[PDB]
Design a protein around this ligand. Sequence first.
Ligand SMILES: *C(=O)[C@H]([C@@H](C)O)[C@H]1CC(SCCNC=N)=C(C(=O)O)N1
Length: 640
Amino acid sequence: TQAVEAGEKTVEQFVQALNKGDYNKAAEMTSKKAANKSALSEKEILDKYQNIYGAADVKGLQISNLKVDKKDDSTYSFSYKAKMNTSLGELKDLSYKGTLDRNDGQTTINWQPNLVFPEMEGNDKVSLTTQEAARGNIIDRNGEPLATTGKLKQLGVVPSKLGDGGEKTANIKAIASSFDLTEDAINQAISQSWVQPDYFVPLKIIDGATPELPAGATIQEVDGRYYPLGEAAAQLIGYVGDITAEDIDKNPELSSNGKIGRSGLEMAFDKDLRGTTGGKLSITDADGVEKKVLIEHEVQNGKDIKLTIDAKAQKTAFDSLGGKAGSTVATTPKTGDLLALASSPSYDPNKMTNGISQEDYKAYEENPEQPFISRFATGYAPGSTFKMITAAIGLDNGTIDPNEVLTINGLKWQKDSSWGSYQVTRVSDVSQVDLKTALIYSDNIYTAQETLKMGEKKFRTGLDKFIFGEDLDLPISMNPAQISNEDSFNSDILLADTGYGQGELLINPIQQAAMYSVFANNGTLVYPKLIADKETKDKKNVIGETAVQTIVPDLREVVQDVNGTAHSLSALGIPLAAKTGTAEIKEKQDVKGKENSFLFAFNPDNQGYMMVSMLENKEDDDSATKRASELLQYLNQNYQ
Ligand SMILES: *C(=O)[C@H]([C@@H](C)O)[C@H]1CC(SCCNC=N)=C(C(=O)O)N1
């Protein structure tokens, strides 16, 4: 039985080498070329597998049900079932069979062309025909296009019809000034090594009306992905890029001639958007007549995907950031629909997917404000806005009396001398501060004191009812929000800092809109939702209903009171509840401290919408509040 042991080993070593793509090592386990031995030599077995398995992009060959028996005295017969992955899907239940050879102290495989595919004879060919699937569309809550396939106007030049000598320089300057192009860049395009004097050298895509075409300029229609909102939704949607040979090795079911999502929803929903390649993989005669069809099915185009996004709100939210670093999240807080996910600054996804220069791409990467960051999915310290949560927790466990008045003298405060030179700082020197006053003026010292009075254990008990540590069901890469680095603060200072939204808190804007939704649902947290068809999910009894009825009237005062931190929003004349905030940061970079500005705002009459905006590393006298009027006007009109 020691012979069939070595035969089973030989067959599995042969299958392993085929699975790994080392066709040479597989061929060197075959017998000499003869009639009842190997049908081909080693070098032509190599080329057989390399051409056929390479044409169909075979990957992941694995066998089962291996039986090795005895035929003659030195001839052992094997058989097994097998499956493999190709460019047209998985190929299952393949019945392979053959014979072995025990000559000296080694066993080899009598190779036959039926060990490539079952039922191949001598000189049979393999044919593969494919039809590429059309990529699906991404559309908003009202069916407007966010990412669609269609026809684009491609501009290029033919160096021959452009002219020579001084005739050339005049036309090149005419092209460069008629389409906003660098005169030195048109020459670098026509000077590339691939160019022949008569070829059409593409230059850029024209996304509007095309002016007069000077001599040598041409315009050709071409199919390609198009993003109608451009940079206004680049971080969310993403972009597609040309598929590489290294992508095909990872997943053979891609179209080597098509596009793959590189970031954003295009990448998160690539499998649903790309569809499936249609076609047929068949074995033919030495002539070419069809012997057996191995795989065949029709092309299935990609499904469309409907988002909760509002295209008008998304554009308004992004424009309001004015190219500064920041982000804005808008929801309908009773259902969790994500109306807008803006991040700024941004990149051009149309320029990204239609070929971008090395310099322009580096300008994006070297940009200190980093336009590639999805800021709506990046953990930040929430800032003073978080005082709402601490207050609601304090009202639930009875630590905070809404009418008790703390007496605060000055702008700085510390628990005792053990804090050293550290002090909680506030902006307004109000002496008598109750809860309503602390929310109107945004008083850290009040919140820091009520947090320390509450204590860590009661503070965390309230915080644990939220979504810290949870993974939201969203097709957006993000990390779970955290209260702090460890399970305990181990610091009175860190406890007070966390009270008014500083410390080691990390919560991204989407997770913030989820937590703050309790004030629009009588203490019920409503999870955010991006896919329009999905069902609303929530989480009851996060904070008490009594706390909501207490805090929301005070949040109205943040807008209506003449000294409220959001009083500029009272100009809108719409029912508003708001809370502004500030987070001071930086630690191991520059000496000057950087400041983040926050705004939370929702309609407290109908709970129709909710907004969380931020400015990262704000310039002086800039704030999220002074930029929010236009989006609030829109959301109030169209989402009651
Ligand atoms: C949080 O409540 C902040 C505090 C942590 O800085 C306070 C201060 C601000 S206003 C910005 C003053 N400059 C530097 N701190 C408010 C606010 O309502 O924005 N809350």
